[PDB]
Structure formats: structure tokens, C-alpha cells
């Protein structure tokens, strides 16, 4: 069904986060809180892990629960990509202009609220 | 319908602008205004958010409102992509040739007017 398209989208997004994270110049003088680096690593690794898990589960085929899990994986891949962009711009610009990073964060909060509201809806309705 | 193609192209362009924002090298002695960096961050994050919203709407599939919202999301993704390209060329060239960046702005002005007028038209007819 839609599993092929969703898996393709998640694979593309994961590959985009990976090619991003590999080509990131860092420095020992960086001012980012180490929590930012920890969250960057966690977000990128979780995105690629979820994409691979979705691909494996889709191509390896209670059952409607697994389909709902597939949809949840797609939505979580989307949200993790959004948070990846947030953390990426943060760790990119925090040494130059903290206001740029904080403005990017504050303007991405409402769309994250909308996404998490849909996710919380589907989790309150998660079987 | 045309939802899958829109999802594919919007995700591609969003990630494209993302890695572009990854490979921008600045310095603490730059001449770019801080407002330019703020606009860079806001525009990039908004483009990513709009593309992700379009992807989620495609994954979602009274229906006419949803179709119009999907088309409007694609249009706004195009708007933000063009504006992001303008900002990126500006920040890339302003350190050497301010006239180059200004010329890039004045050469993307007319198509921006065309798309804004097209956006107002559909938005006016959107409910």
C-alpha cells in the first residue's frame, strides 16, 4: 500500500540528514551547550534508525497495529527531520549570532506544535 | 493524485536548501547585516517546515479544502525556495561585491511578484 511511498520518503529524508551531519565543520572553541551536540547525535541516529526499521518492516512482509506503527514511523521521521533542521541551524549559527538561532527556534515551534498535536491525537487513538 | 509528485519535489527542494545552508562559511568579520542572517535562518526553517507539512498532508490521504491546502503548501514551498535562493546568493556574494547581491535581488524581483500575485489569487479563491 502506501508503505512503499512512506518508506521511500523516510529513506530520502534520512539520507539527507546523514549527508548533512557528515559535512559539518566543528571546532573545540564552539559555544554550543554539549546538550546540543548530544541532541544532534541522538536526532540523526534516531532518524536513520527509524528509516531503516521502517524499510525493513515494510519489505519483510495486530496486523493493523503494525500498519499504524508504519504510519507512526513516517510521522516520527518527519518530526525528527524538523528537529534535525532546528538543531543543525542552531549548531551552525550559535557561534555567530545567537538571535538567529533563537528566532529560527521560536518560529518553528508552532508547526512543531501542530505536528505533535496530530501525533498526540493518533496516540490517544492508538488502539 | 498529484500529491506524490508534489511530496517528492518539495522534499527534494527542502533538503537541497538544507545542505546549501550547511555549506555556508562565514566569519566574525563579515559585512552582512545581522538581519540578513536572521532572515536566512527563518527562511530556511520555514521552507523545511512547509515542505514537511506538505509531506504529512500527502501522507494523510470536505476533501476540496484538503486538496486546496496541499496545492497552497506546494506553492508556498516554491515561494520560500526562490526567496531562499535569493538570500543564499546574497550572503555568498555580499562579502566581495554588494552590487552582485543587489543585482541578484533585482533579477529575482519580477518572478517573485508573479508568484505573489498568483498566491493572492488562489488564496482569495481558497474558501
Amino acid at each position: 500500500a502506501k508503505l512503499k511511498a512512506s518508506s521511500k520518503t523516510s529513506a530520502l529524508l534520512s539520507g539527507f540528514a546523514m549527508v548533512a551531519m557528515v559535512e559539518v565543520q566543528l571546532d573545540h572553541d564552539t559555544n554550543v551547550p554539549p546538550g546540543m551536540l548530544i541532541a544532534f547525535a541522538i536526532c540523526t541516529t534516531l532518524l536513520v534508525a527509524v528509516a531503516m526499521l521502517a524499510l525493513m518492516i515494510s519489505t519483510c512482509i495486530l496486523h493493523w497495529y503494525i500498519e499504524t506503527a508504519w504510519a507512526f514511523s513516517t510521522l516520527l521521521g518527519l518530526i525528527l527531520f524538523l528537529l534535525e533542521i532546528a538543531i543543525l541551524c542552531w549548531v551552525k549559527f550559535y557561534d555567530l549570532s545567537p538571535p538567529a538561532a533563537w528566532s529560527a527556534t521560536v518560529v518553528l515551534i508552532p508547526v512543531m506544535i501542530i505536528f505533535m498535536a496530530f501525533a498526540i491525537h493518533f496516540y490517544r487513538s492508538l488502539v | 493524485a498529484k500529491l506524490k509528485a508534489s511530496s517528492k519535489t518539495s522534499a527534494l527542494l527542502s533538503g537541497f536548501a538544507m545542505v546549501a545552508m550547511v555549506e555556508v562559511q562565514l566569519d566574525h568579520d563579515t559585512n552582512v547585516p545581522p538581519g540578513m542572517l536572521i532572515a536566512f535562518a527563518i527562511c530556511t526553517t520555514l521552507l523545511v517546515a512547509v515542505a514537511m507539512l506538505a509531506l504529512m498532508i500527502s501522507t494523510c490521504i470536505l476533501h476540496w479544502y484538503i486538496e486546496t491546502a496541499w496545492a497552497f503548501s506546494t506553492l508556498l514551498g516554491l515561494i520560500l525556495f526562490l526567496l531562499e535562493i535569493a538570500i543564499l546568493c546574497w550572503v555568498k556574494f555580499y562579502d566581495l561585491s554588494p552590487p552582485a547581491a543587489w543585482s541578484a535581488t533585482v533579477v529575482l524581483i519580477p518572478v517573485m511578484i508573479i508568484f505573489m500575485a498568483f498566491a493572492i489569487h488562489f488564496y482569495r479563491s481558497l474558501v
Partner: antibody
Amino acid sequence: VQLVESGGGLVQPKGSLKLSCAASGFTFNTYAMHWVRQGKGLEWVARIRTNYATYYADSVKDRFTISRDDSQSMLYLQMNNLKTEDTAMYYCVRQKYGNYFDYWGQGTTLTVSS
Amino acid sequence: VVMTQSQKFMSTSVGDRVSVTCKASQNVGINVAWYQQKPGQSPKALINSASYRNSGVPDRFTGGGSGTDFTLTINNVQSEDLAEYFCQQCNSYPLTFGAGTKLELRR
């Protein structure tokens, strides 16, 4: 990073001398530098954009001159025709894109009397 | 651009919130920095862009305002934080500093 500057002490009116500061702990070639003096209220003195532009205060744009030895990683400021009102302390400073100062030097007394 | 200072000696007890002000003259936006000078040392950078604290700064210092008026405030003011505080506009050379106000004590 570490900024340590060392000029001279007591001089005579209408005199001259050059203060120098050593910067160690960052990339000197990628940061604009400043000299800031101290009625106990701090006042700005000079700035150098290490093209190699310079800017000077509203008062002493005729007697002070900056010079950055990027390879030697040093910041120099030569002052001439010093007055009895230039008794101050001179902090070398670096600037990071906000025109705001974060890493200050240690200080250097410059008393100009007779 | 010139920056005024209302009171030079903020007579304040321990642990009580204090508000130091800085009424700039022109429209300077949010390009204001705040520096703290303990008596006899090189002043450190407390606040940049009038809102964001620096890296190694305790979080009793919150600075706000915009345009022409700005204000730093310290809830739960310590005792070792008796020092002087300067505000500086970061918008247009020459970068000027406020007259500076110390952080006094009442006992």
C-alpha cells in the same frame, strides 16, 4: 583565549608611545580587534578590522593609530601628543559580529602628567 | 547615540531582586550589550543582544527591553555580586558606554 597587553607607565605631556597586546588562544586573522580605555566610566578608543580597515573615536582620530601583526599575532596602538586627560587604563579586546566585546585584556596603566 | 543611567548606587539587600536601567537616546533596536566589572578587574560580558546571556554566566541576570529603553534585573541577588554594570550600544560607531552604576548594599 588570552589577551595580555603591556604599555608604559608615566610619560610627559605632548609625548608619545605605542602599546602592544599579545593574543593567544584563537585565530587572530579572523577577528576584529579593539582598544578601550577607562571618571571610571569606560570609553571606546579604536577598532581595527583584521580588508584592514580602521576606525577611531570621536575625540582622538588625530593622535592614535592601530596596527595588527596577524602573523606575529599582536595588536599595536601608537598614541602621540598625549594630554593630561588621557590618564586611563587600556584594555585590548576582540569583537564577535555583534560589535560586542567578550574577551577583554588585563589592563595597562598609562599616566600622562608632568 | 548616548546612554543615560538613572541611579548610580542601587542600594539593595541580599537575595532581593534589583533592577538597573539604561535609557538609550536614539532607536538602537536590540543591539545593546551589558558588562559587569568587579572592582579592579577587566569587565566581563554579561549580556549580548540585550536578551541572551553569555556562556559562563549565572542565570540570575535577565535583561530586556528594546528600541530606546533597556533594563537588567537580578532576582535572588547574591552578595559577591557587588560590582559595577555598564550598558553599551552595539549599533553604530562610535560604540558608546553608559555612565555605569554600581551594585550597592544596605545593612
